[PDB]
Write a protein that binds this DNA or RNA. Structure first.
Ligand code: ATP
Ligand code: 2TM
Ligand code: MG
Ligand code: MG
Ligand code: ZN
Lengths: 143, 94, 14, 220, 56, 1111, 170, 108
DNA sequence: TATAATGGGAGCTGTCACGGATGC
DNA sequence: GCATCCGTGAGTCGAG
């Protein structure tokens, strides 16, 4: 980008790379129900480990996995988001076999359902904010 | 630019919260026909017509101007929804 | 592959 | 005060090479095979080209048009891929509480150690939160500080003085927020030059910000 | 003299120091005067305005 | 208004007829003017002779004939039918073994006929068959992309006329043939042909290591027929080897002329390449007893020779224009004719087996339908059959000269790479380097060069003058690229004294490479610069000063120029302007010397010298394909004596025979108040006052009244529930009367239609009871004026079911067509462009008093921003402006030919002559130098524009020669601080106009499967909010705006109805609901065996169908 | 595809404030049509809604009070302008509509860089956000004058362009 | 019949069926007109006594599906069939008189 | 409701780039 | 463990 005279902040590319690094590969299952070679999200395996180390069980051995942008997009947890990207057949078949449920965490799924997106003014952080005036505030303050 | 937009952005921790507040307040002003306004007669948003100045029909201009005065209070879990709706429909029926 | 050819082969058996 | 000169210099319109083609020589031309002709175009656009010169030049023009045409689809496709990868990423919370961070180099490996270019350091620093306290040039930049452009220029000045080597910074790479990134790891919302508001959809912004210049990206 | 870069730095610095609104006003003003002065400036392109150097 | 021309160069040959490609191609294909016995066995005759005789009873082919058209061209245009001729075929049915023959002439249906200008008429609409460019048939040798040493041979026939064949020497060390994606040793095939180890090793053993891989003992051990059967199992598994079927298959693959067909060009290329001669167009022969081969052995020879490094063997260039040919309209039509004919033949055999085998005639044995269907298919729906561009004469003329790489057998737009899109060196003089689409089609859609001609073989040839010694002969040779590569060709600009070369060192080309050469070494010379470029490109003066991209834009945009009611040829032409009008058949000319008898707006009657009195009807205000009005106006007066070729009447856009695409306006180049910012243009109202840039546009409206099960749709005057105000402009029969002015909402044609089965709602019935009124059984279907349309009604056509000459499609009672014309003045948002690629929309119309003006009272017409010039690097507009100024004050026009034309000094002289008129008369009028002019002169002195110390007049002349004049601000009266370039530029108004483009919708039609709004202005549809716009909203924080789009503004039914009602009542819009197209997704997913379920937080199902989909 | 959306050819208004755009009257009439029927009923222009709509269905049936009523309708409101392709989020921006005659949309110069629009015949789409929520979102978040800096690099986006720099430099 | 998937243009982006409007489902304007009508007719029947309105609602089908015979309206209210016809006639007269002055039902 | 008739017929080529799996 | 095969997709608008 610098070569062509485009100023672009590193943070964005970092946002993408972060998603490229999202997945890991199991080296040893340990006490888990997992198996050698199985691929899953880094968050899900660390949540598993921190759970079973508190259960006094052997941790799951794993190595980091770098996959490109397309494959990372298709490997997402949400099947509505994956089916709408590409490989509509493969995604749908594997997800329908797995009996997958889409928890609607992202923007795409919510867009397809026509739901309010979980971002901006649809963010739970700002969504439930209420407005009132001192007159009505005191009027309700009475009771 | 919306007048005093920087102060409005100063009022909240997230710009989107400012948006939610303004929008909700505007819905309140629309429901009750402006009877509930925290603006005094001289502060009322005006609109030039053929005959002469009238009250600004736009509820968002209003809501923002009201917000600029400290006369509004916003936040989460201030009042249950029932109490708010009912008390506002009491003091200002429509 | 080529169902007509297949049926025309199965036919040639009898 | 010449018009061509003034326009090129002000930034209104024009660059040195185009003005060169106007008053200078058009320059070397290239075959469809990619190898250049040994015979340059000696004419300016003022003097006017010979029909052979013109024809020799049309190759590069055609290759350029076909290049833009074929590239737009690749840029767009990339953009859509990026959007589908980053879409779920939004600013979910204020702090994930991570003690992790990244360390931004102010120098790069002629084989030696030399300062980077200002533009680069700015593009890696500006509007970010320090993950550790730094003391340089008698100034304390505290942990949690969002670096202003002036904070950056200061850090560069300190690096020129040998006081600072790398700058510790909160980054999306190290952010522990689930299904997104937090406010501190992100830093400024560069559009408002102030810390990002919780709820801004960061992924889409990253994707679009990467993809948009892609049409201007050189070659194929 | 004021070129693309110095005007860009001006707009940015105005954004930082003054408001968003005031920067918008500064923008509108710069637009107005820029156009106004560009009109009467006498900027034009003739064929003789592309000057072949004697060094060529 | 005299016309002065520049340039040294004299053209030894005129441009060929520009439509000759189309016209001559089709003429060769039909052979309609040739008596049958003299026909050449090409095109249609060739297809007939190729299909017949039909074996088994034998049906042979005697001949064919084309009758005259059932209807004339205009009548076909009006009646929405095809201009065509009946095709009869004389055929004899010979019964084998009865010796009996029955001759009959069988009617085959109709073949479309090309018109004078090279276009067609299909179902009433003018069309154009576009020439396709493709890889020429033949034998090629290409470098193997796998390994450096090896090479791959390819044998290519005509596209539908046979399979491709590859020859490759493997790493295995054996020679392999690839056919139908099946690879087998070439050995076996060679053995099939009667070849022996000895015969092969003798000639082909010159290279031993390579030939030893061709040697397989087990193959030569087999009998030739044993090699035949061995091959048949390999090619098609699943079929039994059969001596009857196996020979028949391999014959049809290779030696069959009716199945495998190499082009005549393929034959020639193969012969010239392999140094052999072909007896036929196949790769082998069936001549008894066994198969005999032509191509395979020499192809193998060339392959091995190229492999070893043997001299005289080189790889072919696929993009070379010797290796790429052109299939023109005639060939493309002939192919489909061959196809339909084949289907007809299969039909004939079928009908020949079935039914009585005793009594049969050619009439009973032949079904015309397949052929008719094939031709109609080709013409009506095809990628190469294109709706003709009628916008201006040059539009059509260019459209006919287009060359497409796409189409059937062509490239896929997605898969086209850099190679085919590139301009090859061999494009010189053949395919125009500048003119193509700027978009995704770039390099795929190209244009035929001016002097370029396509030969019998289909290769493009360009003319070159012969040079013997130093002398230039006037004999002209048209060469292919393959031939051109053999010589040294000098540029056309090189100095000549008489026919002798006057240059000691002359610039030339050897195989495309520019080289400086001795006059003794020159074999040939370019005819003209013109031959390098297309017709549109040749119309840009000063082209040498413009970068190729903006030149491309100018070329393309001339096509888009609309005819103006008063149109003028450019003040600076290229000299090609008249010939373009001539060839395009825009205008009307005198056939012989003679005297003009009568002159009318409608007609021109001319008496010739032989006493014959000929009458020429003028086409007046006819609607073109693009809706631009095409009308001829008389250029002569009663009693005027005219010679042969003299102009009788002017074409739709032309001025006195010269091609006029636009207006000549007085421009000032200078920024004006941000109104010209970023390519926008400032226009003076003085242009609208004098009707400059005003054009006529006719639109056609059509309505059908049909027969319904609910009763007839009637077209009448009385429409239920309408005021007299609405019907005041209506005809007594229900139509609108000619001359009326129609505005949006008004009724063009009244139509009543029987209501569907009615289930009156209780409210409706109670209302009826309250008002005690008719409750009519008919509805108003009447065709009204669309939003943003209107004009004066020029014509009406009315066709009814019972009529003397009228046939309608079944169920239709009547058809009514109203024609509505409008006169469009230039308005803000209309697109303007010049020939150098400068384009922009008018952003402002200032009144004359605000306009910049000269020292005398004359205001400038147009103001163009100079900021557009440097980046774009097209300087031709500047020169055109200078010379336009000179020609403005002198009162003359100019011709500057393309690369040979006016230079700076000559223009400077013309500008001096101009200044003498401009400033000179001012002194005699008793006026000196103005104070403002003095100040401006001081500014210019500081700018180094003028020399210090000279008199004011000397300095003003100094500026004027630089093309700059003092200009006064119209608003102020103060002068512009600098002197400004001002002069006449030729600017045209394009077909893109806001009146057409502006569209808006609140609510409207919705689609069937998905309740989403329709697209397009015509359907009154909504704008598209795409994935990227959705991204734009998500990137902002607007959740509610986005959801509102998705749900509320489209595809949510309850939501949209409730929203409209909410706004109508003045209450805020309801919360969004489930989008219908998601339900569509759910059900379309349930059609597949997958089950989709919306759930709670408790993982309990939620019904989004509200119980309607569940028991 | 959505309702309440138009499209037309853009043309530069130099006179507009940064937060404004010119909107053709004929576009505005159709885009805001329901609001206009309502406001026509709020005045003495039409007996009811159906009468008002029946009045707007013909060009010759439109009065002068209709336009002033339209001016009342759009007061304070914003519309979204969009130019294809939209590469980043600034491909859509919010403006206060200023009714202009003629059929062209007037665009402000300083936003031309962000849309990558020029006057060579570019076209733009207009969308009317309906609810108070959508209007608040557009006015606060998407307003042209509220976005002066690139989200990509913190550098300014709306900054003096060609003619403006030209004048100031001069 | 013809295929709704029949290509439009030489690109891959258009189909025949995309140009076919959906007639069946009511328009937002249509639905608004009906919804406004029910309200104006409910406003008009309020000027009537509750019996006049109820008689007129009963036998016009405004309530409970199909219209009722005036013999059935008579058994409902407890009057003679002649009375119900008369109550309907007087109610209609009241509606015509009222509507004549207001002109709010002109939308039909 | 009855001579006997017993294995089809066309095809259509100038991308690619990975990738995931399959096969030496 | 490498050569090969198949399957998938290749920017947006507008108009046809
Ligand atoms: N394929 C496109 N996608 C998006 N915008 C386009 C496209 N084609 C044209 N435009 C827009 O219209 C402007 C000018 O149009 P352009 O000169 O490219 O041809 P056009 O007017 O669209 O159609 P035509 O090729 O018939 O002239 C462009 O600058 C661009 O903004
Ligand atoms: N198929 C297409 C064709 C065009 N476009 C768009 O239209 C513009 C024209 O570019 P352009 O190169 O013609 C003019 P510009 O970019 O302003 O350069 P200049 O003014 O300095 O001379 C592009 O910027 C694209 O956004 C598109 O998206 N898809
Ligand atoms: Mg531009
Ligand atoms: Mg443009
Ligand atoms: Zn974090």
């Amino acid at each position: 980008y610098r070569a062509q005279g485009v100023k672009l902040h590193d943070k964005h590319i970092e946002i993408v790379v972060r998603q490229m690094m999202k997945y890991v590969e199991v080296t040893d299952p340990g006490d888990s129900r997992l198996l050698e070679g199985q691929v899953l999200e880094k968050w899900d395996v660390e949540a598993l480990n921190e759970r079973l180390i508190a259960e006094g069980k052997t941790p799951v051995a794993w190595k980091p996995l770098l996959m490109g942008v397309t494959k990372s997009a298709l490997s997402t947890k949400s099947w509505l988001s994956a089916a709408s990207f590409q490989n509509t057949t493969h995604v749908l078949t594997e997800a329908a076999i797995a009996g997958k449920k889409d928890e609607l965490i992202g923007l795409k799924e919510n867009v397809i359902l026509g739901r309010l997106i979980p971002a901006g003014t649809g963010s739970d952080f700002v969504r439930f904010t209420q407005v009132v005036d001192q007159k009505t505030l005191k009027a309700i303050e009475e009771a | 630019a919306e007048p005093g937009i920087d102060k409005l952005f100063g009022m909240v921790d997230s710009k989107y919260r400012l948006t939610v507040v303004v929008a909700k307040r505007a819905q309140q002003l629309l429901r009750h026909g402006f009877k509930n306004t925290v603006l005094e007669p001289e502060e009322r948003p005006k609109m030039q017509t053929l005959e002469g100045l009238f009250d600004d029909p736009n509820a968002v201009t209003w809501a923002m101007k009201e917000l600029l005065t400290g006369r509004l209070v916003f936040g989460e879990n201030l009042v249950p929804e029932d109490r708010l709706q009912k008390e506002m429909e009491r003091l200002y029926p429509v | 592959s080529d169902p007509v050819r297949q049926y025309l082969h199965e036919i040639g058996q009898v | 005060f010449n018009p061509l000169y003034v326009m090129a210099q002000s930034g209104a319109r024009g660059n040195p090479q185009q003005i060169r083609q106007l008053c200078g020589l058009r320059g070397l031309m290239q075959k469809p095979s990619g190898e250049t002709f040994e015979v340059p175009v000696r004419s300016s656009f003022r003097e006017g080209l010979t029909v052979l010169e013109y024809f020799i030049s049309s190759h590069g023009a055609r290759k350029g048009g076909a290049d833009t045409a074929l590239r737009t689809a690749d840029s767009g496709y990339l953009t859509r891929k990026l959007v589908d990868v980053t879409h779920e990423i939004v600013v979910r919370e204020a702090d994930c509480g991570t003690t992790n961070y990244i360390s931004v180099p102010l120098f790069q490996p002629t084989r030696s150690l030399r300062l980077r270019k200002r533009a680069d350091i700015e593009a890696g620093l500006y509007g970010r939160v320090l993950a550790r306290e730094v003391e340089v040039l008698g100034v304390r930049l505290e942990e949690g500080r969002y670096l202003s452009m002036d904070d950056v220029h200061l850090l560069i000045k300190a690096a020129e003085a040998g006081e600072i080597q790398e700058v510790p910074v909160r980054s999306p790479l190290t952010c522990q927020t689930r299904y997104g990134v937090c406010q501190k790891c992100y830093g400024y919302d560069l559009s408002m030059a102030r810390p990002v508001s919780i709820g801004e959809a960061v992924g889409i912004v990253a994707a679009q910000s990467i993809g948009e210049p892609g049409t201007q990206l050189t070659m194929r | 003299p004021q070129e693309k870069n110095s005007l860009k730095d001006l707009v940015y610095q105005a954004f930082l120091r003054l408001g968003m609104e005031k920067t918008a006003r500064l923008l509108d003003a710069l637009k107005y005067y820029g156009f106004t002065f560009s009109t009467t400036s006498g900027i034009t392109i003739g064929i003789d305005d592309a000057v072949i150097p004697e060094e060529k | 208004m005299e016309i002065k021309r520049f340039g040294r160069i004299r053209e030894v040959i005129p441009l060929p007829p520009l439509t000759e490609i189309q016209v001559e191609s089709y003429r060769r294909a039909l052979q309609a003017d040739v008596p049958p016995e003299k026909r050449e066995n090409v095109g249609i005759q060739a297809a007939f002779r190729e299909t017949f005789p039909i074996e088994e009873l034998v049906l042979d082919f005697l001949e064919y004939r084309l009758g005259e058209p059932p209807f004339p061209q205009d009548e076909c245009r009006e009646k929405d039918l095809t201009y065509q001729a009946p095709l009869y075929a004389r055929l004899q049915l010979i019964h084998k073994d009865t010796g009996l023959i029955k001759e009959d002439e069988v009617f085959l249906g109709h073949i479309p006929l090309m018109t004078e200008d090279g276009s067609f008429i299909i179902n009433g609409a003018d069309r154009v068959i576009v020439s396709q460019i493709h890889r020429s048939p033949g034998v090629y040798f290409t470098p193997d992309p796998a390994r450096p040493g090896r090479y791959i041979a390819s044998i290519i026939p005509l596209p539908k006329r046979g399979p491709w064949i590859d020859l490759e020497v493997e790493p295995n060390g054996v020679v392999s043939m690839k056919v139908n994606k099946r690879k087998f040793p070439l050995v076996l095939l060679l053995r099939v042909l009667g070849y022996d180890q000895e015969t092969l090793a003798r000639e082909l053993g010159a290279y031993g290591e390579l030939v030893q891989g061709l040697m397989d003992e087990s193959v030569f051990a087999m009998r030739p027929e044993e090699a035949l059967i061995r091959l048949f199992t390999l090619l098609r598994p699943g079929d039994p080897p059969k001596r009857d079927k196996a020979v028949a298959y391999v014959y049809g693959l290779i030696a069959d002329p009716r199945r495998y067909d190499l082009g005549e060009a393929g034959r020639y290329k193969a012969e010239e390449k392999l140094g052999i001669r072909l007896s036929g167009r196949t790769l082998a022969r069936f001549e008894d007893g066994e198969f005999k081969d032509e191509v395979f052995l020499p192809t193998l020879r060339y392959l091995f020779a190229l492999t070893a490094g043997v001299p005289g063997h080189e790889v072919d260039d696929i993009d070379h224009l010797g290796n790429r040919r052109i299939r023109t309209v005639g060939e493309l039509m002939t192919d489909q004719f061959r196809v339909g004919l084949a289907r007809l033949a299969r039909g004939v055999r079928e009908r020949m087996l079935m039914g009585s085998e005793d009594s049969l005639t050619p009439a009973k044995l032949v079904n015309s339908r397949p052929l008719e269907a094939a031709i109609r298919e080709f013409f009506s729906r095809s990628q190469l059959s294109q709706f003709k561009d009628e916008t201006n004469p040059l539009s059509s003329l260019r459209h006919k000269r287009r060359i497409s790489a796409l189409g059937p057998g062509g490239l896929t737009r997605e898969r086209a790479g850099f190679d085919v899109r590139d301009v090859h060196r061999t494009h010189y003089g053949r395919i125009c380097p500048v003119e193509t689409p700027e978009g995704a089609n770039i390099g795929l859609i190209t244009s035929l060069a001016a002097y370029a001609r396509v030969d019998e073989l289909g290769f493009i040839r360009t003319p070159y003058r012969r040079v013997v010694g130093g002398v230039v002969t006037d004999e002209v040779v048209y060469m292919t690229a393959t031939e051109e590569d053999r010589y040294t060709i000098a540029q056309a600009n090189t100095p000549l004294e008489g026919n002798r070369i006057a240059a000691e060192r002359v610039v030339a080309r050897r195989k495309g490479e520019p080289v400086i050469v001795s006059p003794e070494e020159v074999e040939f010379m370019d005819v003209s610069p013109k031959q390098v470029f297309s017709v549109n490109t040749n119309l840009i003066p000063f082209l040498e000063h413009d970068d190729a991209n903006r030149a491309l834009m100018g070329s393309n945009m001339q096509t888009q120029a609309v005819p103006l009611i008063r149109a003028q040829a450019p003040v600076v032409m290229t000299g090609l302007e008249e010939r373009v009008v001539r060839d395009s058949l825009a205008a009307l000319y005198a056939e012989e010397d003679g005297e003009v008898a009568k002159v009318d707006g409608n007609r021109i009657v001319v008496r010739y010298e032989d006493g014959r009195l000929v009458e020429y009807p003028l086409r007046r205000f006819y609607r073109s394909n693009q809706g631009t009005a095409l009308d001829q106006r008389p250029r002569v007066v009663v009693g005027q004596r005219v010679r042969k070729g003299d102009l009788l009447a002017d074409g739709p856009a032309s001025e006195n025979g010269f091609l006029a695409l636009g207006q000549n306006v007085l421009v000032a180049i200078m920024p004006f108040d941000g109104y010209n910012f970023e390519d926008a243009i400032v226009i003076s109202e003085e242009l609208l006052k004098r009707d400059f840039y005003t054009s006529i546009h006719i639109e056609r409206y059509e309505i059908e009244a049909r027969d319904t099960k609910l009763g007839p749709e009637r077209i009448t005057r009385d429409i239920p529930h309408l005021s007299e105000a609405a019907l005041r402009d209506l005809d007594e029969e229900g139509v609108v009367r000619i001359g009326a002015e129609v505005k949006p909402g008004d009724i063009l044609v009244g139509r009543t239609s029987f209501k569907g089965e009615s289930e009156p709602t209780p409210e409706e019935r109670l209302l009826r009871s309250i008002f005690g009124e008719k409750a009519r059984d008919v509805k108003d279907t009447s065709l009204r004026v669309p939003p943003g349309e209107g004009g004066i009604v020029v014509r009406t056509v009315r066709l009814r079911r019972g009529d003397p000459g009228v046939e309608l499609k079944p169920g239709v009672r009547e058809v009514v067509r109203v024609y509505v014309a409008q006169k469009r003045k230039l308005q803000v948002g209309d697109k303007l462009a010049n020939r150098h690629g400068n384009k922009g929309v008018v952003a402002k119309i200032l009144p004359v008093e605000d306009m910049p003006h000269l020292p005398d009272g004359t205001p400038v017409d147009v103001i163009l921003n100079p900021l557009g010039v440097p980046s774009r690097m097209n300087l031709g507009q500047i020169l055109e402006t200078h010379l336009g100024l000179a020609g403005y004050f002198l009162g003359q026009r100019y011709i500057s030919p393309i690369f040979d034309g006016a230079k700076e000094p000559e223009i400077k002289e013309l500008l001096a002559q101009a200044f003498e008129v401009y400033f000179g008369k001012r002194k005699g009028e008793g006026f000196g130098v103005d104070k403002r002019e003095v100040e401006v002169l001081r500014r210019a002195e500081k700018l180094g524009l003028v020399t210090p110390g000279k008199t004011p007049e000397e300095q003003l002349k100094e500026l004027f020669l630089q093309g700059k004049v003092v200009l006064y601000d119209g608003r102020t009266g103060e002068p512009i601080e600098g002197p400004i370039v001002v002069g006449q530029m030729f600017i045209m108004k394009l077909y893109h106009m806001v009146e057409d483009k502006m569209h808006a919708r609140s609510t409207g039609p919705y689609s069937l499967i998905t309740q989403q709004p329709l697209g397009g202005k015509a359907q009154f549809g909504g704008q598209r909010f795409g994935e990227m716009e959705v991204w734009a909203l998500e990137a902002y924080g607007a959740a509610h705006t986005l959801q509102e789009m998705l749900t509320l503004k489209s595809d949510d039914i309850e939501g949209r109805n409730a929203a409209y009602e909410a706004i109508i009542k003045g209450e805020d819009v309801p919360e969004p609901s489930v989008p219908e197209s998601f339900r569509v997704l759910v059900k379309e997913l349930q059609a597949l065996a997958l089950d989709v379920q919306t759930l709670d937080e408790k993982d309990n199902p939620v019904d989004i169908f509200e119980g309607l989909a569940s028991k | 595809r959505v309702d309440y959306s138009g499209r037309s050819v853009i043309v530069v208004g130099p006179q507009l404030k940064l937060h404004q755009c010119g909107l053709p009257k004929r576009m505005a009439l159709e885009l805001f049509k329901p609001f206009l029927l309502k406001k026509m009923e709020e005045k003495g222009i039409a007996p009811n809604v159906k009468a008002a709509r029946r009045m707007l269905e013909r060009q010759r049936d439109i009065k002068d009070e209709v336009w002033d009523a339209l001016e009342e309708v759009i007061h304070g409101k914003v519309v979204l302008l969009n130019r294809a392709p939209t590469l980043h989020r600034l491909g859509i921006q919010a403006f206060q509509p200023v009714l202009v005659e003629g059929q062209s949309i007037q665009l402000h110069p300083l936003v031309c860089e962000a849309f990558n629009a020029d006057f060579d015949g570019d076209q733009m789409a207009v969308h009317v956000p309906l609810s108070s929520f959508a209007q608040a979102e557009a006015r606060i978040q998407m307003l042209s004058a509220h976005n002066l800096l690139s989200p990509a690099s913190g550098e300014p986006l709306a900054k003096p362009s060609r003619d403006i720099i030209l004048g100031l430099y001069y | 019949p013809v295929s709704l998937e029949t290509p439009i243009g030489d690109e891959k982006d258009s189909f025949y069926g995309d140009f076919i409007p959906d007639e069946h489902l009511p328009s937002p304007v249509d639905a608004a007109t009906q919804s406004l009508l029910s309200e104006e007719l409910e406003k008009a029947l309020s000027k009537l006594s509750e019996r006049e309105a109820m008689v007129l609602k009963l036998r016009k089908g405004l309530i409970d599906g199909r219209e009722h015979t005036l013999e059935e309206v008579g058994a409902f209210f407890g009057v003679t069939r002649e009375r119900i016809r008369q109550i309907e006639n007087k109610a209609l007269r009241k509606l015509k008189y009222h509507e004549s002055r207001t002109r709010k039902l002109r939308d039909f």
